[PDB]
């Protein structure tokens, strides 16, 4: 009876895989980036990457390889998920719409199977006869690639060697032949087998088994010209073949493990080698000509090329360009040069891609004082480590802001034909037109020539020929640049006036009620051309330079008044081409077609708040696609702006937005302002490159933020950040970090680079005297990061071998100071379990960190939370609750000790709490009167916990090492010794992400209950809320209906995706909504929407209300 809802806030940003090839077409070079459940398809260009296609999969991508079966024009995509969904995928373009089709699929998972060490390996043989799969120990699986087999049937072949490190198919081989390093007693080896598929046997390979290095771990199969196998291990690199053997051991590559390779030239002459330190190598195969024999291997060599971000994936592209897929840091695009620069670096960055990395911990703050949540993460590790400040929405920087009421429009206007800066932006008051004589400092109310202070401007653009145009209510007027005198004018033959403007820089292309003219202001006059009349009253107009026009404009957008329609004409012309009935009863308020970068659309804002958008085209003249999306509750007002190279649409309303686009699909992001009525781009004197903003009853000018839905800050650290707390009174963050140092010549330890803890402004060390009785070591610190500048104000170092595990910031009992507190442990590589450790009580009143209280403990203080003005804490399977004397010391209260490793704690504000490792979870209350711990209930499942959260009094949420979520509840029935003692897992759902931290808060605030944010190893941010039974059921319903509707890449079943899955068991998801799924209801076509409303009422327009309302939870 538990009802919950999970949505993604930020997609996974860590890169898990990346392959290069010819998937879009044969003339075409692609790069496929795998994230987790997402697949990214780019085309390699002279500049970098052409985004072409991003989809989602219903599983974690675990193998991703491209191949070419017999007689296929382009490559196919092989993919294998971690739940053992295999499919072959194809790229099909048909239309201007792209589709990723499943050639074949099936689940290749076996009942008999122990998931080996080093996980899943998916290889494909060079002739494309077969795909080799190593899922479990002692078995090799084989999916034959004959044009039948669309279901992907497989056989297994008992593998005598039950501990394989790595495997590849060998090039230049008569039968399919494997090559792999394995471990037994006696060390590590390489062996070869041929694979015969007629036989389903493993036949003797082409060459005798040799021994290789104890740490050999990578097998590269060299292409036909050389055709052997390189073997990468700590310290050693070696080529094997038939009876060839070659072996270099350059002492450079001993410092750090090689973890990833990539082939550079197709013949196998040069490779890339990714190191755990981020160093990039070139492995060079010295090739040597006989005349007749075959081209051979002379020698092996390594060049230290330089430094990338810590590479997990790596792929060479066109012409020196290499993509660097990182999991621990930002992914990048780098250049390889033949000549080094200063410091000997052949490598140069071109582009850097945000990875929110492993998010090891986080918290939510109100940084900018407003009730909007801001999220700050501990991200990355080692040299990639960092903080990331994450903000919802787009921001603007407020300068001088004149409290100027009732304003009605504005345009980019100057007072000269000179400086591209401007001094007066004549707008339009309530029925009126006014003047802002502004030196770019202070404003003035001296009114101007011909711009009568009792009429109104509709358009007012930079019209050449020495004039300051003023298409007014009455009818277009003229005030000269230099002369400033009233030049020429217009007036309606009857007694009538312009009602709707529309122009560029040489036109007056307006409307009088239903009439539509065109009056040219050449060298200071008026010059009419074409004329029609509308069946209805004209509401709005669009025309602007589109194609290769300057003066006279080509096409024509029209929003009419009684039939509620938007139509496509010409202008001149006005002829009918496409009438789109918008339906309902609110008239269009603004109309726009626009240059994105490459592709065109139509957008129309009704006066209710909604907006429609279509598939236009600035050259033919005909509409297509339909979509509806609501913004404001007031009539929305549109405008284009160019900020970088590209052009977006600012939408003005009570909920001001910006219209964007990914590939060329449409995105709608908030702007972080109160309300906005009118707006225009700028470039001024006292306020250069900018945006003018007419609001409720003020005005404003300032610059504008990035683009994305999310804003992301980034404070690099060059060491591993591990925990984080905000202290408001101190107005700073406490952050726990770790840095690596190696063995010194004098046995000491130093450091490979400047870290945040070494470069800290003030510093200090641990003067505790208790624990006193080629080599790597972790030095651990507590950093004091400033709140606004994010500089490292102070760095305290801990004892040698003291790891900092936990961190809190709080008041304790009657003392009115805020201490920060840290819980540590004495780690020696040898010792299996920490025997010692301490809780340390710091004070940062100002300037420095004072040690205020120190308390020895008997194990690793894995975590601690503030209680009720007490200190709750766990110590190596023990949960103590310390009190804080008026004499400044922590004295013990009670301790629970029935648990195996208590890793995680949270507190039901009051007196209840969770905690318990490997077991699963446990509920526990503090009995005030007794001064005691009472174990209330327990969940009895073998969940290896990673995170824990109290949703409420009777709901406990938990994340487990197998990418599952679940919810526990105490039973609501009699016999309070038994049933009230166990707690039922009332919710089950498979996330597909590893969760490190839950914490209550939200990014939205300027249908659902509660807000719990969560961060993941992959840099994915997620959100959990609660639901009523009816919502749950409405939503549950809509999910099955949708599954039927939505085509899935590869054709994997959504129910199978979201199922709970461990080694022990597999269950359908319960009590959980896949908000991502629910949300994707808005992307499907109008036909497909109706398909699932069928059957209080039941309507699609109605459903998109509910989903639009759900989307704004995050």
């Amino acid at each position: 009876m538990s009802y919950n809802y999970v949505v993604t806030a930020q997609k996974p940003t860590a890169v898990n895989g990346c392959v290069t090839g010819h998937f879009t077409s044969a003339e075409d070079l692609n790069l496929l980036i795998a994230k987790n459940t997402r697949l990214e398809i780019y085309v390699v260009t002279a500049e970098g990457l052409r985004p072409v296609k991003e989809v989602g999969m219903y599983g974690k991508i675990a193998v991703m390889e491209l191949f070419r079966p017999k007689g296929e024009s382009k490559d196919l995509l092989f993919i294998l998920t971690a739940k053992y969904n295999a499919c072959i995928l194809e790229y099909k373009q048909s239309g201007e719409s792209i589709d990723i089709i499943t050639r074949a699929h099936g689940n290749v998972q076996d009942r008999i199977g122990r998931p080996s060490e080093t996980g899943i390996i998916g290889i494909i043989d060079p002739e494309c006869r077969m795909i080799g799969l190593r899922l479990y120990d002692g078995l090799f699986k084989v999916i034959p690639l004959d044009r039948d087999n669309k279901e992907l049937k497989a056989f297994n072949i008992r593998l005598e060697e039950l501990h394989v490190i790595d495997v590849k198919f060998l090039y230049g081989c008569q039968a399919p032949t494997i090559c792999f390093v394995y471990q037994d007693p006696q060390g590590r080896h390489v062996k070869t087998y041929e694979v015969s598929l007629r036989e389903k046997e493993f036949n003797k390979g082409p060459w005798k088994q040799e021994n290789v290095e104890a740490e050999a771990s990578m097998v590269i199969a060299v292409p036909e010209p050389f055709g052997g196998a390189i073997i990468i291990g700590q310290e050693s690199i070696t080529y094997h073949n038939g009876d060839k053997y070659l072996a270099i051991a350059p002492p450079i590559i001993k410092q750090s493990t090689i973890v990833c390779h990539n082939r550079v030239d197709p013949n196998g002459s040069r490779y890339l080698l990714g190191d755990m330190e981020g160093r990039l190598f070139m492995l060079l195969l010295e090739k040597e000509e006989q005349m007749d024999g075959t081209v051979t291997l002379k020698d092996l060599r390594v060049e230290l090329l330089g430094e990338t971000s810590i590479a997990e994936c790596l792929t060479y592209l066109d012409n020196g360009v290499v993509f660097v897929g990182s999991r621990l840091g930002d992914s990048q695009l780098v250049k390889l040069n033949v000549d080094s620069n200063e410091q000997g670096s052949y490598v140069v960055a071109m582009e850097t891609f945000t990875n929110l990395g492993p998010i090891v911990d986080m918290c939510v703050v109100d940084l900018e004082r407003q009730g909007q949540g801001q999220l700050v993460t501990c991200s990355g590790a080692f040299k990639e480590g960092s903080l990331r400040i994450i903000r919802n929405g787009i921001g603007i920087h407020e300068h001088a802001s004149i409290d100027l009421p009732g304003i009605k429009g504005l345009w980019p206007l100057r007072s000269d034909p000179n400086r591209e800066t401007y001094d007066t932006l004549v707008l339009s008051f309530v029925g009126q037109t006014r003047v802002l004589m502004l030196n770019g400092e202070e404003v003035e109310e001296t009114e101007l020539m011909g711009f009568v202070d009792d009429q109104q401007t509709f358009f007012c653009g930079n019209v050449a020929h020495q004039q300051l145009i003023q298409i007014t209510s009455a009818s277009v007027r003229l005030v000269s640049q230099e002369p400033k005198a009233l030049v020429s004018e217009w007036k309606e033959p009857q007694a009538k006036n312009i009602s709707v403007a529309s122009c560029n820089s040489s036109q007056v292309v307006v409307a009088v009620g239903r009439a539509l003219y065109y009056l040219q202001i050449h060298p200071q006059e008026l010059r009419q051309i074409s004329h029609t009349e509308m069946e209805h009253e004209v509401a709005c107009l669009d025309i602007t330079p589109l194609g290769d026009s300057n003066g006279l404009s080509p096409l024509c957008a029209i929003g009419l008044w009684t039939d509620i329609s938007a139509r496509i004409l010409k202008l001149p012309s006005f002829e009918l081409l496409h009438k789109e009935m918008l339906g309902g009863e609110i008239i269009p308020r603004s109309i726009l077609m626009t240059t994105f970068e490459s592709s065109h659309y139509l957008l129309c804002a009704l006066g209710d708040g909604a907006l429609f958008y279509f598939g236009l085209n600035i050259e033919t003249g005909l509409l297509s696609d339909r979509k509806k999306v609501t913004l404001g509750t007031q009539p929305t007002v549109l405008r284009t702006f160019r900020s970088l190279s590209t052009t977006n649409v600012f939408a003005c309303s009570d909920r001001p937005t910006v219209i964007y686009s990914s590939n060329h699909k449409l995105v709608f992001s908030n702007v972080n302002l109160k309300e906005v009525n009118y707006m225009c781009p700028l470039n001024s004197d006292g306020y250069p490159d900018s945006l003018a903003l007419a609001n409720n009853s003020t005005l404003t000018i300032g610059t504008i933020d990035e683009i994305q839905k999310l804003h992301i800050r980034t404070v690099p650290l060059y060491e591993s950040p591990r925990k984080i707390c905000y202290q408001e009174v101190s107005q700073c963050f406490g952050v726990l970090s770790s840095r690596i140092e190696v063995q010194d010549t004098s046995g000491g330890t130093t450091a490979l680079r400047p870290s945040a803890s070494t470069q800290a402004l003030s510093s200090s060390v641990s003067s505790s005297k208790l624990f006193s009785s080629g080599e790597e070591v972790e030095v651990h610190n507590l950093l004091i990061i400033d709140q606004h500048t994010f500089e490292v104000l102070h760095a305290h170092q801990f004892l040698q071998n003291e790891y900092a595990l936990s961190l809190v910031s709080c008041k304790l009992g009657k003392d009115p100071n805020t201490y920060f507190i840290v819980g540590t442990a004495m780690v020696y590589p040898e010792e299996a379990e920490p025997k010692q450790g301490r809780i340390v009580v710091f004070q940062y009143s100002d300037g420095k960190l004072q040690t205020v209280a120190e308390k020895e403990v008997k194990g690793a203080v894995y975590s601690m939370v503030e209680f009720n003005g007490k200190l709750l804490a766990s110590i190596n399977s023990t949960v103590r609750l310390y009190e804080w004397t008026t004499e400044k010391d922590v004295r013990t209260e009670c301790n629970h000790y029935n648990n195996i490793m208590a890793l995680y704690l949270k507190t039901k504000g009051d007196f209840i709490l969770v905690g318990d490792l490997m077991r699963s979870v446990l509920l526990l209350a503090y009995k005030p009167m007794e001064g005691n711990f009472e174990e209330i209930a327990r969940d009895f499942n073998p969940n290896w916990m990673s995170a824990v959260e109290i949703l409420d009094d009777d709901n406990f949420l938990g994340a487990e090492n197998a990418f599952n979520l679940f919810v526990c509840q105490k039973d609501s029935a009699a016999t309070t010794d038994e049933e009230r003692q166990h707690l039922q897992e009332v919710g089950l759902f498979h996330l597909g992400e590893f969760v490190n931290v839950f914490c209550h808060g939200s990014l939205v605030m300027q249908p659902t209950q509660g807000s719990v944010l969560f961060g993941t190893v992959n840099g994915m941010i997620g959100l959990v809320t609660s639901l009523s039974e009816s919502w749950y059921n409405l939503l549950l319903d809509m999910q099955n209906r949708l599954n039927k509707v939505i085509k899935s890449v590869g054709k994997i079943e959504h129910s199978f995706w979201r199922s709970f899955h461990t080694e022990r068991k597999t269950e359908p998801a319960t009590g959980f909504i896949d908000g991502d799924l629910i949300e994707s209801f808005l992307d499907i076509s109008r036909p497909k929407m109706q398909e699932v409303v069928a059957n209080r009422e039941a309507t699609a327009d109605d459903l998109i209300k509910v989903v639009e309302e759900l989307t704004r939870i995050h």
């Binding site: 999991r327 621990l328 492993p358 090891v360 590790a381 591990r722 790891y803 595990l805 442990a825 780690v827 020696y828 590589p829 040898e830 010792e831 299996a832 379990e833 920490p834 690793a860 490793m901 890793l903 990673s946 090492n961 590893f994 490190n996 190893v1017 992959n1018």
Partner: peptide
Amino acid sequence: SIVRTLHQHKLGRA
């Protein structure tokens, strides 16, 4: 050192 092995998981490792 379980502490180590432990933290490694947080970084998504063996």
